Amino acid sequence: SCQLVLVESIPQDLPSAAGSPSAQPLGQAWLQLLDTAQESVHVASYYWSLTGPDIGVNDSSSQLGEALLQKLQQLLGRNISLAVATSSPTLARTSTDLQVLAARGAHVRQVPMGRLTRGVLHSKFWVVDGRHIYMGSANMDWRSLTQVKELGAVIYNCSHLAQDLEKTFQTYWVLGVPKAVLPKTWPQNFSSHFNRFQPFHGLFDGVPTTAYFSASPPALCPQGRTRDLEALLAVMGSAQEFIYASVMEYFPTTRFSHPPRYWPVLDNALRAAAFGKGVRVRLLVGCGLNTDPTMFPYLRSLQALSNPAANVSVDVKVFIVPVGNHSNIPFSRVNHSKFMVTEKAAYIGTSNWSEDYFSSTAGVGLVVTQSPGAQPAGATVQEQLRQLFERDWSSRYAVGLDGQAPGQDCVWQG
Amino acid sequence: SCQLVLVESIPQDLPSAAGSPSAQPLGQAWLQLLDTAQESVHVASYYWSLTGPDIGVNDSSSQLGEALLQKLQQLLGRNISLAVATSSPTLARTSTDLQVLAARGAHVRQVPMGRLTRGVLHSKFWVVDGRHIYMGSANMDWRSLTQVKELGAVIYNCSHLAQDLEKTFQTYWVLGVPKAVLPKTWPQNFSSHFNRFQPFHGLFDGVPTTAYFSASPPALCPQGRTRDLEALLAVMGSAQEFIYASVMEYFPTTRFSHPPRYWPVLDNALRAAAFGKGVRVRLLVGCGLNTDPTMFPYLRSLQALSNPAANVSVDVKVFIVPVGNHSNIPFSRVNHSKFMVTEKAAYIGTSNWSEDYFSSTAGVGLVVTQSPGAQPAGATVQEQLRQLFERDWSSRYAVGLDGQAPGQDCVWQG
Amino acid sequence: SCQLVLVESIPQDLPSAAGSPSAQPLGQAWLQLLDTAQESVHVASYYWSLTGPDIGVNDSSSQLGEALLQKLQQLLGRNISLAVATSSPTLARTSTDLQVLAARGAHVRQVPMGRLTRGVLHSKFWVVDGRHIYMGSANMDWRSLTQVKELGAVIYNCSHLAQDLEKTFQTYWVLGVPKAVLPKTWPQNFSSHFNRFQPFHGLFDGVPTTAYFSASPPALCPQGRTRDLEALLAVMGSAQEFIYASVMEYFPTTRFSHPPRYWPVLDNALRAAAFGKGVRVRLLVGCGLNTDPTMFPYLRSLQALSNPAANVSVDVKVFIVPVGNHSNIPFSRVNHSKFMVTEKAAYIGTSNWSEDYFSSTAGVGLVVTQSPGAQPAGATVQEQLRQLFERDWSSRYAVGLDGQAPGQDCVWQG
Amino acid sequence: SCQLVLVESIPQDLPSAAGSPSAQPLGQAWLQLLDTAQESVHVASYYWSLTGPDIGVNDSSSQLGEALLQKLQQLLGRNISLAVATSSPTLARTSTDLQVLAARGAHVRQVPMGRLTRGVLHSKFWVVDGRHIYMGSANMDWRSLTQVKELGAVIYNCSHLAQDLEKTFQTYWVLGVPKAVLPKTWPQNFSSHFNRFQPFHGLFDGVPTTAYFSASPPALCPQGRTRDLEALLAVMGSAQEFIYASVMEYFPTTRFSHPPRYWPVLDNALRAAAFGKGVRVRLLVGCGLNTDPTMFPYLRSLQALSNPAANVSVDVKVFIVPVGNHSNIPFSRVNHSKFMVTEKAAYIGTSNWSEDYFSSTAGVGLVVTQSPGAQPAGATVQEQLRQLFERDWSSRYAVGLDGQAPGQDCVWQG
Numbered sequence A, B, C, D: 001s002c003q004l005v006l007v008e009s010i011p012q013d014l015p016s017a018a019g020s021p022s023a024q025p026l027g028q029a030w031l032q033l034l035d036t037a038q039e040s041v042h043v044a045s046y047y048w049s050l051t052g053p054d055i056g057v058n059d060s061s062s063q064l065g066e067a068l069l070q071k072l073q074q075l076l077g078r079n080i081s082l083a084v085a086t087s088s089p090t091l092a093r094t095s096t097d098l099q100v101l102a103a104r105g106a107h108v109r110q111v112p113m114g115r116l117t118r119g120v121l122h123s124k125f126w127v128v129d130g131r132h133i134y135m136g137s138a139n140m141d142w143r144s145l146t147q148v149k150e151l152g153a154v155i156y157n158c159s160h161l162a163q164d165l166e167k168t169f170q171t172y173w174v175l176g177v178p179k180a181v182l183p184k185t186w187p188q189n190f191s192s193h194f195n196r197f198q199p200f201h202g203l204f205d206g207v208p209t210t211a212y213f214s215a216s217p218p219a220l221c222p223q224g225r226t227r228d229l230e231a232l233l234a235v236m237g238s239a240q241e242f243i244y245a246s247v248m249e250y251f252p253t254t255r256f257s258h259p260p261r262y263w264p265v266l267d268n269a270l271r272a273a274a275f276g277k278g279v280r281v282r283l284l285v286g287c288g289l290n291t292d293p294t295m296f297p298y299l300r301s302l303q304a305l306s307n308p309a310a311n312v313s314v315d316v317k318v319f320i321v322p323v324g325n326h327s328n329i330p331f332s333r334v335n336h337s338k339f340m341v342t343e344k345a346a347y348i349g350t351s352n353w354s355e356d357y358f359s360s361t362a363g364v365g366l367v368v369t370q371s372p373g374a375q376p377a378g379a380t381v382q383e384q385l386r387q388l389f390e391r392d393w394s395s396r397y398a399v400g401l402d403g404q405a406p407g408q409d410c411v412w413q414g
Ligand SMILES: *[C@@H]1O[C@H](CO)[C@@H](O[C@@H]2O[C@H](CO)[C@@H](O)[C@H](O)[C@H]2NC(C)=O)[C@H](O)[C@H]1NC(C)=O
Pocket: A003, A036, A156, A157
């Protein structure tokens, strides 16, 4: 009886072409998920900024996030367990949401990924009632609800996947105990049940579906849990027609370490897929006022492989979100979606493509494969993701690596 | 008392800039080497086309090659042992020089390389009297003498390295026995004694020198010998100032295997050296009428990584040779040099840069490092190689990847 | 409503101890299954020797088998489809009943497992009307009905498990097509919805039950299916109290492949369960006048780990069958049972415990778990299996590895 | 110009058979090695019990050991550097040798092996002057000179191998810094030159030789350093004629961790070598008054594998050293030799065969290999090791596992 719903958030002043595909709004889905839950809610988030004053800005668009916060407090009014795991080196330092929720009675246990693996807790997911889950790239932020284009999935009335996500969250929580040390081998309970070798089978809305999860870094991977890097390489290798991807940043290197090293695993996998199998490879990387200008040379190197004569297609584009009058809001107006679409599978993750997110920084990934069902009316998850990717690609907000019109509000060359 | 000298052959009608550095001509070196022989001569060659009419053309430029054959016959007139190892799939099918030598009393032997490992005997080297060696990419052909640019190195009075090369020559010779198979483990007879970690040390002309050899494929590499790919990777990694490489063909893919695959080992090593260590990388690729156009996209990728601001500088150029009134010579007017020079070593190879060369075909490389001696003397082999590379790079015959002049000669986009 | 019952065949002239547990006779269950058929019958078998003179023997003990064939023929007299899959290198090459059934109208496909995976179709299961199901270590042979002791399980009125085994039989049937090749990936139709971590739940006669299937080799194992080896290792590892096992042949080495190699997976699992978890281990191998004596030392290698002080308890015994006057029946009077019992689960398979049965030779097995329900009168299936194993263990026909004596029927080296 | 010679220590009152092979005494070899020391001595040892009063006994057999200390003190009288690394959980808690040496001007660092990975520093070797090396199974104890049979190898005048071992000693030394932690990746300074794939190649007294070094635990192995476990696995797999192994204790299980686990890697490799290749396997374990009885059944398992008719020959014996009058000395009269000789290689180790010695406890191992060369008269190292092993095997102190004669000073069943 498992149900799967693609959810997404279009920011303000971003109209789409007529007839373009759309999914459920993020705010409505989050409100419905919070209302449905009646036993307990477990959230794994990088940071918490749900109010305008938390950042230090005052704007009407924050209202939605504020409402969500109120709903959370309303959840505390019905005596519902609420456990939060957040990275010790969190981003928003002046936020006070966690203190208010703790005062209301919500347990919050900071997990120090900075001391253990020299990274951060980038995972973002919800497990409510042990029956419904949500997983996306959306932080617990009003910007992610109203000012940042975002994507994710929500699974309803599904038990085993909820149990697996609960296992991962329990690993995070156990690590969050004060004065903790990485175990050499995780206990029996933390072992994952579904892997890429034996994915979880289900009847989603009446159609077959094989879905599984993946975790990172390798230290936080219990027995039987696929690494998110391994899942990415698997969904790349199994491709035979095309590969579409959309990430916020793409560096084939190590970002924050010393000395920096070249990390070609994803780049090599993409090139091998494009060459050996002759699959159409498309990349759509978001851009904004805060993106690192040094990413572009690697993108140009990737696109230089294009050669229709020899059956190579590695087209690459940058997604541009106009800033408009929202210049006061920091770290906003960017495309934060991270996902991959294939004719066989579909990957939704919460980590960028860099050595840190697969070596040190924690993260989770979800792989879904929906075979066509008896009723052809219901489009598969792969088809919906591909349609969304095509809508993003054909839109005027995406430009080629050569298009550098002055009115684009991006760093470009720095 | 080893004496190592760099040798090279410049095709006619290819003048260089005034004051350009130059090495000893190849014809003189080969003539002197054949003149000094008094015990035996061993040669490993891909094909034999010394006679002008062999190919099917008549020209004055082949006269030099004829002389070489005469000298070989003169050797057969002085009771000098002569052994030849030739690949079973020879290129020049219409070859009669081997028949003439065999009739005179040679010891030719066809190595069934294609039957064994689906490759060819691309190794080309000379061992004279078990004391002198010659190693380069010049197959026995007058085109390499007068119509193809070529680089190599010869060593005099260096018995240890001569025996080391005799080891792999004996490997080829044993494999050349009719109805032979690849041994599971090579006997101690063919075991080497100098490798990358314990190179042959000596005083070359009063200058400290560490030199060693390589081999390929690993199936044909006996115990104690470094694979050519391993030597190339070591030379790339150990570099800290620059890497100047020149090859006729550069392919990060399997060349003739089916199905095609992506083999990024050399590409990954080059990118990692350029980025992590911040070393200047320059590549020079030969460009002739027979060059595969599909090679150009990959090169362009390596060119796109150039980011001078972020301490990542990679440059790629194509070296073309004007043809003019030299159209009747086939498979000529190409830059056949295959070598690499860093600030700490110098590698001279006889094989191109592709997966098949380092995994299926027979290839051999030589690595030489010359420390600055106490006496001023002249310049190290590294300095001479760097000077030759700079002269070629600054020449009018080397153009950028985007500099496709209409009056040029190479294939370019095909 | 699913009714799962165990069945076993007691060989003629093989009395048991007074007041010993038993189960439903195999012949009666097979007759009931053939009588209740109304739509179709699908059979997967290794060979067919229903008739007595099929193997060239004139004995009354074959009469029962003859009757079965008669019933089968009567089935084809009621316009009921009959699908049969047999191994191409089948034993008893003088088989004639298969030709008779094919002439009467039964579709027969000979799976070429010999040329496909270098194995044989050792799997023997049975599907009736897509609703009833049988599986045991009993070939369609008269001597397997009255001269040889085996054990199997038959489930009545269970649709989902019947359809899963129908999917496996459809895999075999598709492979039986002339000029067929191994599919690298399997269509969605050949996909099991019940695996080890997601078994089929049911209320068999009230008591809850979790049952799932396993198939081998992995080449013939479709997506979502559990490999036999995986199921065996899972049941061995899950056990915390005791492990009982009965297999005709036990070899930790490859049997028919070249060159012979060690395959210690099952040995290692048994030893680890015995030592690390302190699990009592009892093993019962079979004996026959045609048995490989080289199996015996390995069993002794298992027997030596019998230190009661260190909480390591491993016992191994052999089961002899008195030949009596039945010396004229080839390949008979052998313990054919292949099953395994723990305190929590029960595995019933159609494969021996060598390497080839899990890499090349096809086989099928079932893992069933029954927990006590509201009514404790009905003993769990694991308890019945343990009772049968204890009856066999205490039988006079079972002797330890030291109980060699005159008059035994084992090969006993030689 | 490297020289290799085996050196063994024969206990007091242990007369071997007349005309038996033998090598240099341990005490004289150590004294000569210390005399030849001129620059620095680096010693890695488990503990120090040089003097008799260290334990608290009064025996004349300690004389030699005390003299050794005197020699060491005389070394410190010549202003010679002396660095010693010992395990933090050392055995002899009363010894004052380290304190006396530190008073005289030594350099002692207590490596916190117990806290880093829950193990001990079982490695024992000497690096003298950076040119000579020694390594065996001898601790810095007088009990190791006149009361415990031991074996090791000493090498003179070999700079490369000495530097290779000095790299491991430097790893231990830097781990001995207070409050130090295990680095994620060891720097290039600790990278090993020679490993399994490219062993050091040299000429020992005119005999060609290949030799390398192996270290454990996996965590303390830098880049390019082969691990002891994989070294043993490869040496045993490459065997084709026989494998003669001698050790103190043989546990295919975890030794002192919790919970206990089965560790069959060495047992599986032994059985695979015995069966697949049909090699002759001989195992000789040393039993003393402190031997754990639980080892005996496991060995019996291997002895139960014997089957001459099937080309599977395995034999196991035990070595009993009579106590005689030497009953007051604790942990004495035990065969401490740990080595293994095959027809192609000879391995001399430091750690026993158990899980902890290859996962947590740190040890070092050497794999030498000599082939006939310019001095065929001189017996190779493997020949000498085989001769010593056969001398021990044929000695009256070697008793089969079935041998349970009274009066033997071995625990037996306990
Ligand atoms: C998840 O399960 C719940 C409980 O079965 C579903 O809630 C029911 O939905 C049906 C159809 O809309 C209603 O007629 C019932 O009244 C609902 N019951 C309750 C108690 O709310 C729900 O529809 C399922 N799917 C989701 C939540 O997406």
